[PDB]
Design an enzyme around this catalytic site. Structure first.
Site, mmCIF file in Angstrom:
data_model
loop_
_atom_site.group_PDB
_atom_site.id
_atom_site.type_symbol
_atom_site.label_atom_id
_atom_site.label_comp_id
_atom_site.label_asym_id
_atom_site.label_seq_id
_atom_site.Cartn_x
_atom_site.Cartn_y
_atom_site.Cartn_z
ATOM 1 N N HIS A 68 0.831 -1.235 0.000
ATOM 2 C CA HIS A 68 0.000 0.000 0.000
ATOM 3 C C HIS A 68 0.854 1.269 0.000
ATOM 4 O O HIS A 68 0.637 2.143 0.842
ATOM 5 C CB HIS A 68 -0.991 -0.050 1.158
ATOM 6 C CG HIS A 68 -2.095 -1.021 0.945
ATOM 7 N ND1 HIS A 68 -2.144 -2.210 1.606
ATOM 8 C CD2 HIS A 68 -3.192 -0.973 0.148
ATOM 9 C CE1 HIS A 68 -3.227 -2.864 1.239
ATOM 10 N NE2 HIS A 68 -3.892 -2.128 0.349
ATOM 11 N N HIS A 106 -6.050 7.292 -3.141
ATOM 12 C CA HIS A 106 -7.080 6.429 -2.501
ATOM 13 C C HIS A 106 -6.516 5.675 -1.284
ATOM 14 O O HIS A 106 -7.321 5.123 -0.503
ATOM 15 C CB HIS A 106 -7.721 5.486 -3.498
ATOM 16 C CG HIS A 106 -6.876 4.292 -3.788
ATOM 17 N ND1 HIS A 106 -5.768 4.368 -4.568
ATOM 18 C CD2 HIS A 106 -6.970 3.013 -3.386
ATOM 19 C CE1 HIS A 106 -5.197 3.167 -4.631
ATOM 20 N NE2 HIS A 106 -5.906 2.321 -3.919
ATOM 21 N N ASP A 107 -5.205 5.582 -1.115
ATOM 22 C CA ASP A 107 -4.614 4.840 0.035
ATOM 23 C C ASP A 107 -3.633 5.751 0.802
ATOM 24 O O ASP A 107 -2.776 5.214 1.529
ATOM 25 C CB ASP A 107 -3.896 3.579 -0.450
ATOM 26 C CG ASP A 107 -4.753 2.320 -0.532
ATOM 27 O OD1 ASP A 107 -5.715 2.189 0.253
ATOM 28 O OD2 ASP A 107 -4.435 1.460 -1.384
ATOM 29 N N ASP A 217 -8.289 -0.778 -8.279
ATOM 30 C CA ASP A 217 -7.643 -1.144 -7.002
ATOM 31 C C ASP A 217 -7.088 -2.563 -7.046
ATOM 32 O O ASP A 217 -6.021 -2.795 -6.427
ATOM 33 C CB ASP A 217 -8.604 -0.945 -5.841
ATOM 34 C CG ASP A 217 -7.875 -0.867 -4.521
ATOM 35 O OD1 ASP A 217 -6.649 -0.592 -4.539
ATOM 36 O OD2 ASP A 217 -8.529 -1.100 -3.500
ATOM 37 N N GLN A 269 -5.694 -17.754 -3.522
ATOM 38 C CA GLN A 269 -5.766 -16.938 -4.754
ATOM 39 C C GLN A 269 -6.949 -17.401 -5.606
ATOM 40 O O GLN A 269 -7.713 -16.494 -6.073
ATOM 41 C CB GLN A 269 -4.414 -16.924 -5.470
ATOM 42 C CG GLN A 269 -3.365 -16.083 -4.743
ATOM 43 C CD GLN A 269 -3.754 -14.625 -4.750
ATOM 44 O OE1 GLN A 269 -3.905 -13.990 -5.797
ATOM 45 N NE2 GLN A 269 -4.030 -14.110 -3.568
HETATM 46 C C1 LIG Z 1 -4.293 -10.755 -5.472
HETATM 47 C C2 LIG Z 1 -5.036 -9.932 -4.455
HETATM 48 N N1 LIG Z 1 -5.311 -8.601 -4.731
HETATM 49 C C3 LIG Z 1 -5.956 -7.786 -3.822
HETATM 50 C C4 LIG Z 1 -6.353 -8.294 -2.534
HETATM 51 C C5 LIG Z 1 -7.090 -7.442 -1.520
HETATM 52 N N2 LIG Z 1 -6.090 -9.665 -2.287
HETATM 53 N N3 LIG Z 1 -6.379 -10.404 -1.208
HETATM 54 C C6 LIG Z 1 -5.856 -11.662 -1.367
HETATM 55 C C7 LIG Z 1 -5.951 -12.753 -0.334
HETATM 56 C C8 LIG Z 1 -6.551 -14.014 -0.982
HETATM 57 C C9 LIG Z 1 -6.568 -15.059 0.102
HETATM 58 N N4 LIG Z 1 -5.487 -15.801 0.508
HETATM 59 C C10 LIG Z 1 -5.913 -16.612 1.499
HETATM 60 C C11 LIG Z 1 -4.917 -17.530 2.256
HETATM 61 C C12 LIG Z 1 -3.887 -18.150 1.517
HETATM 62 C C13 LIG Z 1 -3.106 -18.828 2.619
HETATM 63 C C14 LIG Z 1 -4.182 -19.253 3.582
HETATM 64 C C15 LIG Z 1 -5.458 -18.677 3.015
HETATM 65 C C16 LIG Z 1 -7.264 -16.330 1.778
HETATM 66 N N5 LIG Z 1 -7.661 -15.387 0.859
HETATM 67 C C17 LIG Z 1 -8.958 -14.719 0.644
HETATM 68 N N6 LIG Z 1 -5.264 -11.730 -2.580
HETATM 69 C C18 LIG Z 1 -5.420 -10.482 -3.148
HETATM 70 MG MG LIG Z 2 -7.300 0.897 0.390
HETATM 71 ZN ZN LIG Z 3 -5.608 0.421 -2.873
#
Ligand SMILES: Cc1ncc(C)n2nc(CCc3nc(C4CCCC4)cn3C)nc12
Ligand SMILES: [Mg+2]
Ligand SMILES: [Zn+2]
Length: 313
Positions: A68, A106-107, A217, A269
């Protein structure tokens, strides 16, 4: 006034594409942003001296966190540039002015921690702002910087034009709170599918701009695979630091934030692309057909995470 920003040939051509990566040369990012303001809005939108001074104050108020940071801000603005340039005639003069600025801002002053960690830590900002804590902070920091002497890039707007542009920026920044994205896209989905979506309805435009803000974003998932993959490391490096801080408050973090669960990243992912990214770019493409390359790029990266799980990388 007769002073254009120009970029080297590879950048001049590739900056127009959705998948453009702004590169590792920090000192070129302000130039890139001005280039995009100039082509997206016009050389007359902002007083160059004021715009340059505003850009450098914004940079100064982004912190040295893994994800960020100032690079994220310029990346999110470039995706917005690509959307605006591929949808020439759908957006007002004020929208074009406000949305690139909204994206850059935005951040502002992000600390690398989620709204949820601020609330569990009992951070002062969590008492000042009960929901969308960081996003209200980011808008507050944007207004602060606009009010520094020689930084009012909107000085030539009328009192009411000024109020409208600050209102576009406010809603645009609030929309980057991912908690709000799910309902916003459900409503846009229903409106598109029942044919009630109407871009002369200001509350409908608001929703569409909210969705554009989520799209820009999350645009790391729309890059070439090596960019997507290396950005995902920065993303998790913040989440895992937050997980460590959760464990310091005596709270088992969610698996997303637990570095002990690195092995499960590929599956996390997939959930993220299926639950958030793909639906986002799908609805966006339905509303703004020329944004299809974002959906197509996102689908390609989903398929790359599938290959990772199948041990083909
Ligand atoms: C590529 C990307 N871009 C923006 C944002 C906000 N995110 N958030 C993520 C987390 C995606 C995720 N990993 C997990 C863990 C993996 C190890 C244990 C579970 C859970 N979850 C939802 N990937 C992104
Ligand atoms: Mg933000
Ligand atoms: Zn952002």
């Amino acid at each position: 006034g007769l002073m254009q920003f120009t970029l080297p040939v590879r950048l001049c051509k590739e900056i127009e594409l959705f998948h453009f990566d702004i590169g590792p040369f920090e000192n070129m990012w302000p130039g890139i942003f001005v280039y995009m303001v100039h082509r997206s809005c016009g050389t007359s939108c902002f007083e160059l001296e004021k715009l340059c001074r505003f850009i450098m104050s914004v940079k100064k108020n982004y912190r040295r966190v893994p994800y960020h940071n100032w690079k994220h801000a310029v990346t999110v603005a470039h995706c917005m540039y690509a959307i605006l340039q591929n949808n020439h005639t759908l957006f007002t003069d004020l929208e074009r002015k406000g949305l690139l600025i909204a994206c850059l801002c935005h951040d502002l002053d992000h600390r690398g921690f989620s709204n949820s960690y601020l609330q569990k830590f009992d951070h002062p900002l969590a008492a000042l702002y009960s929901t969308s804590t960081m996003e209200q902070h980011h808008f507050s920091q944007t207004v602060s910087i606009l009010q520094l002497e020689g930084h009012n890039i909107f000085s030539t707007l009328s009192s009411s034009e000024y109020e409208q542009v600050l209102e576009i920026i406010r809603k645009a920044i609030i929309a980057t709170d991912l908690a709000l994205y799910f309902g916003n896209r459900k409503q846009l989905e229903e409106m598109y599918q029942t044919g009630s979506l109407n871009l002369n309805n200001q509350s409908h435009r608001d929703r569409v701009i909210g969705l554009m803000m989520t799209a820009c974003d999350l645009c790391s998932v729309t890059k070439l695979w090596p960019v997507t993959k290396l950005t995902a490391n920065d993303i998790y490096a913040e989440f895992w630091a937050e997980g460590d801080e959760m464990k310091k408050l005596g709270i088992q973090p969610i698996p997303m934030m637990d570095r002990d669960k690195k092995d499960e990243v590929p599956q996390g992912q997939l959930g993220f692309y299926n639950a958030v990214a793909i639906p986002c770019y799908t609805t966006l493409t339905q509303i703004l057909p020329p944004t299809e390359p974002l959906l197509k790029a996102c689908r390609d990266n989903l398929s790359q995470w599938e290959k990772v799980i199948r041990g083909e990388e």
